[PDB]
Design an enzyme around this catalytic site. Structure first.
Site, PDB file in Angstrom:
ATOM      1  N   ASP A 229       0.867  -1.159   0.135  1.00  0.00           N
ATOM      2  CA  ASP A 229      -0.066  -0.026  -0.202  1.00  0.00           C
ATOM      3  C   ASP A 229       0.818   1.423  -0.023  1.00  0.00           C
ATOM      4  OD1 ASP A 229      -2.318   1.550   0.110  1.00  0.00           O
ATOM      5  OD2 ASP A 229      -2.251   1.500   2.572  1.00  0.00           O
ATOM      6  N   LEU A 231       3.145   4.516  -2.839  1.00  0.00           N
ATOM      7  CA  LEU A 231       3.594   4.938  -4.289  1.00  0.00           C
ATOM      8  C   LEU A 231       4.968   4.282  -4.454  1.00  0.00           C
ATOM      9  CD1 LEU A 231       2.764   8.661  -4.413  1.00  0.00           C
ATOM     10  CD2 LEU A 231       1.664   6.471  -5.313  1.00  0.00           C
ATOM     11  N   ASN A 434      -2.055 -17.301  -9.867  1.00  0.00           N
ATOM     12  CA  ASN A 434      -1.573 -16.838 -11.109  1.00  0.00           C
ATOM     13  C   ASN A 434      -2.614 -16.392 -12.251  1.00  0.00           C
ATOM     14  OD1 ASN A 434      -2.151 -19.378 -11.580  1.00  0.00           O
ATOM     15  ND2 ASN A 434      -0.963 -19.350 -13.357  1.00  0.00           N
ATOM     16  N   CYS A 436      -3.865 -18.415 -14.620  1.00  0.00           N
ATOM     17  CA  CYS A 436      -4.965 -19.179 -14.944  1.00  0.00           C
ATOM     18  C   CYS A 436      -5.220 -20.079 -13.459  1.00  0.00           C
ATOM     19  CB  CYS A 436      -4.665 -20.290 -15.873  1.00  0.00           C
ATOM     20  SG  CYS A 436      -4.086 -19.683 -17.597  1.00  0.00           S
ATOM     21  N   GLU A 438      -4.090 -21.911 -10.902  1.00  0.00           N
ATOM     22  CA  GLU A 438      -3.522 -23.203 -10.395  1.00  0.00           C
ATOM     23  C   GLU A 438      -2.511 -22.964  -9.677  1.00  0.00           C
ATOM     24  OE1 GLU A 438      -2.411 -21.921 -13.376  1.00  0.00           O
ATOM     25  OE2 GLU A 438      -0.877 -23.153 -13.891  1.00  0.00           O
ATOM     26  N   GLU A 620      -3.191 -26.309 -24.034  1.00  0.00           N
ATOM     27  CA  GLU A 620      -3.633 -26.533 -25.524  1.00  0.00           C
ATOM     28  C   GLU A 620      -2.751 -26.876 -26.413  1.00  0.00           C
ATOM     29  OE1 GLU A 620      -7.464 -24.918 -27.180  1.00  0.00           O
ATOM     30  OE2 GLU A 620      -6.364 -26.644 -28.200  1.00  0.00           O
ATOM     31  N   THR A 621      -1.552 -26.210 -26.697  1.00  0.00           N
ATOM     32  CA  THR A 621      -0.444 -26.700 -27.352  1.00  0.00           C
ATOM     33  C   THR A 621       0.208 -28.048 -27.094  1.00  0.00           C
ATOM     34  OG1 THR A 621      -0.098 -24.205 -27.724  1.00  0.00           O
ATOM     35  CG2 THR A 621       1.408 -25.551 -28.428  1.00  0.00           C
TER      36      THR A 621
END
Lengths: 734, 16
Positions: A229, A231, A434, A436, A438, A620-621
């Site tokens: 909290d 600057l 994070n 996604c 997990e 996916e990949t």
């Protein structure tokens, strides 16, 4: 006559028999594929003076266009043809050069790291060459080859030249990761790891797959940053994001501590304006290295449900509002605990506070639920504290409505993250996740980009392919190779910010998960929705966690436990099986099959190399390369369609021919109960978290509208079975 | 599309 033009631009006469031979070769062993059908479709597009490369592309695409559920073996016919064309494209002939010559040439061109030649001798490269099996390239599917060619194989992005083939990638990734091993065991490990990756048993992340072996050292994909909290901390956080998104990493930002709008301006730091303005500054930092300020670079920002500005924070991605109150290009994770859920059940109110006005509350929220309730009720009655009261039903419905309409408003159950975890909440609490949802690692706020007292979490990932193992005891070897290779990587890669290096060297945290879960369930004759896979899931996730801890334990014996091993619950002899949510006992009755008490003792005595080992991520990949169902999710259909520059990419689920009726597709599930029970059973053994999804189909409900009652009931079920986080909500487009 | 109708009497029995 039909003239053919070649690579040097010289004319030869067409040879249709040569083409047919290649087609015949590629078809070997496949069923239901017509060579004539492919020849008819491609020959008609030939013309006088067509380059040879263009003939290859034409027949490849011809085969690719016939991929279907009725003839899935076209996937391999097209792939082999594609492999053949890539071989000629890189080596000028089908047969790949000898490993040593290949590495020498690539090092001279600046495409491979020069340490390879320093670290291994020519005799050692000759030995490695005898391990390689170039015929393993004939086992990829068409979609897999497209990913390899598109983002894995070393190439010249400007000229379109490909310099290597799959097997050199696999062998050299292994060579690099185990390069610092003693010569007596070095090549034995190299061979074993190469066999595991080239036969799809272990999957590695994209960054590793494309970089390890090349001159780079940037391999981090997830960084978790916690903002204080002030600057100075706001600026440090912002600077850290810019450095990490320029290297293509997903960011997870905890901005929960920033004080609310109106609170006492304290120290010159104009915090009178509140959270929004600073959230907008984090969004521009996240998109700082993105094409046209919107594409590439992603982040998920977390905040507590009781923050005084929660009602403005919950509608930040609402697409209807003034630009000055909207931060649309980031996803948000709401943080809840048991007290908040109780208020909802009893129909009471929730009190909103600014973190700066309630001493001890924020920390208690993650590390001590008893102390949280104590402080929370105290401050509710304290009239000197600035507060606001809202109806729990109203707050929960506002959140769920935004989650339902965008799909990207996530949940994190902070109590579950700290009562059932590898870390001691008094010393190293888990305060965020994070991108996604997990990863779940400890963090500390920075006061400056180079502050050495801060902590940024990073996690190295990988996954086991459940469709490529025959029995669960194959995980013993696989866990050894996966842990050893990733632990080596922690010392191999660079750290741009001091605080990131601190967490990686202190805790050495890993996140190994699974792919192909659906296929696995289908071949064992189980489904997701009816409770039939509970016991098999329990038995399977016990083996994974057991062998991962065993491999890590063996590694600590050899090379020493991680420096901050003493902050883990493992250090005190506490195991995953001791802290799981007890309600799980009512939905699974499988017994433990491994000796956890022998292991308990060993961990206590020799410690662990890594503080965390497992995490269940989306994929996916990786899954595309091994023709596997993604992570733990059910397939949306038997055939996947993806768009490409070359055409439409189709991929058929594994063994469709024999298992079409065994699969249970995403929209065939009657609801989320079955799936949410499996996630709960997986979470009993996982060190971190899982990317769980919730799915809803409007046509299963009266008037095509998902009832809020059903949304809140599934939220509570998740909580009941110990689910730590919740990712996407998928709503059907039908 | 969602139907924002919450029955708190029905949820109250749930055991967390």
């Amino acid at each position: 006559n039909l003239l053919v033009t070649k690579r040097d631009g010289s004319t030869e006469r067409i040879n249709l028999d040569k083409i047919h031979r290649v087609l015949d070769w590629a078809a070997e062993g496949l069923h239901n594929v017509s060579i004539s059908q492919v020849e008819l479709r491609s020959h008609i597009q030939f013309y006088d003076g067509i380059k040879t490369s263009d003939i290859h592309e034409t027949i490849i695409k011809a085969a690719a266009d016939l991929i279907s559920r009725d003839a899935p073996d076209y996937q391999y016919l097209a792939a082999r043809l594609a492999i053949f064309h890539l071989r000629k494209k890189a080596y000028g002939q089908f047969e790949p050069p000898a490993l040593y010559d290949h590495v020498v040439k690539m090092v001279e061109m600046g495409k491979y790291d020069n340490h390879l030649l320093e670290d291994y001798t020519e005799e050692e490269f000759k030995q490695m060459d005898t391990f390689i099996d170039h015929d393993r390239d004939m086992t990829f599917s068409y979609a897999a080859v497209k990913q390899l060619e598109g983002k894995y194989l070393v190439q010249n992005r400007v000229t379109g030249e490909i310099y290597e083939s799959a097997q050199f990638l696999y062998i050299l990734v292994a060579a690099c990761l185990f390069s610092n091993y003693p010569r007596e065991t070095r090549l034995q490990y190299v061979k074993r790891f190469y066999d595991a990756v080239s036969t799809f048993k272990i999957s590695l992340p994209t960054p590793i797959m494309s970089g390890v072996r090349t001159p780079t050292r940037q391999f981090s994909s997830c960084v978790l940053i916690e903002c204080g909290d002030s600057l100075d901390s706001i600026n440090a956080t912002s600077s850290a994001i810019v450095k990490y998104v320029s290297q293509r990493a997903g960011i997870g930002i905890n901005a929960g501590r920033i004080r609310a709008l109106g609170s006492p301006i304290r120290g010159g730091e104009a915090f009178h304006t509140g959270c929004i303005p600073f959230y907008k500054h984090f969004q521009t930092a996240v998109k700082s290295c993105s094409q046209g300020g919107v594409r590439g670079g992603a982040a998920t920002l977390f905040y507590p449900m009781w923050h005084l500005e929660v009602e403005s924070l919950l509608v930040l991605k609402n697409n209807r509002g003034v630009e000055g109150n909207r931060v649309r290009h980031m996803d948000y994770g709401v943080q809840i605990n048991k007290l908040m859920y109780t208020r909802l059940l009893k129909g009471e109110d929730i009190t909103l506070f600014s973190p700066s006005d309630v001493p001890g509350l924020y920390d208690a929220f993650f590390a001590d639920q008893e102390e949280f309730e104590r402080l929370y009720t105290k401050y509710e009655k304290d009239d000197s504290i600035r507060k606001q009261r809202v109806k729990a039903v109203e707050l929960f419905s506002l959140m769920m409505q935004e989650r339902a309409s965008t799909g990207r408003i996530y949940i994190q159950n902070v109590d579950h993250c700290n009562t059932h975890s590898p870390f001691d909440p008094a010393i190293a609490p888990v305060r965020q996740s994070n991108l996604c949802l997990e990863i779940a690692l400890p963090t500390k706020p920075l006061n400056d980009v180079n502050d050495e007292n801060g902590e940024i979490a990073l996690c190295t990932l990988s996954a086991f392919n459940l469709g490529a193992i025959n029995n669960l005891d194959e995980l013993e070897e696989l866990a050894i190779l996966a842990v050893r290779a990733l632990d080596a990587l922690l010392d191999y890669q660079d750290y741009p910010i001091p605080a990131a290096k601190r967490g990686a060297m202190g805790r050495r945290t890993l996140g190994i998960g699974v792919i192909n879960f659906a296929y696995y369930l289908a071949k064992h004759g189980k489904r997701y929705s009816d409770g039939s896979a509970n016991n098999l899931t329990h038995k399977t996730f016990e083996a994974i966690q057991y062998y991962l801890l065993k491999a890590s334990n063996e590694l600590a014996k050899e090379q020493g436990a991680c420096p901050w091993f003493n902050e883990t619950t493992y250090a005190k002899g506490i195991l995953p099986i001791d802290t799981y949510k007890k309600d799980l006992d009512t939905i699974a009755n499988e017994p433990l099959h491994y000796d956890w008490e022998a292991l308990r003792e060993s961990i206590k005595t020799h410690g662990l190399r890594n503080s965390t080992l497992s995490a269940l991520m989306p994929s996916e990949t990786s899954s595309q390369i091994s023709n596997a169902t993604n992570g733990i999710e059910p397939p949306r259909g038997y055939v996947s369609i993806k768009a490409s520059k070359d055409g439409i990419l189709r991929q058929v689920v594994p063994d469709y021919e024999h298992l079409h009726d065994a699969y249970e597709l995403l929209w065939e599930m009657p609801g989320n109960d079955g799936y949410l029970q499996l996630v709960g059973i997986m979470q009993k053994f996982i060190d971190q978290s899982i990317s769980a999804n919730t799915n809803y189909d409007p046509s299963r409900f009266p008037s095509g509208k998902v009832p809020m009652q059903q949304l809140l009931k599934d939220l509570l079920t998740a909580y009941k079975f110990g689910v730590k986080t919740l990712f996407y909500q998928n709503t059907r487009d039908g | 599309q969602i139907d924002s109708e919450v029955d708190t009497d029905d949820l109250s029995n749930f055991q967390l």
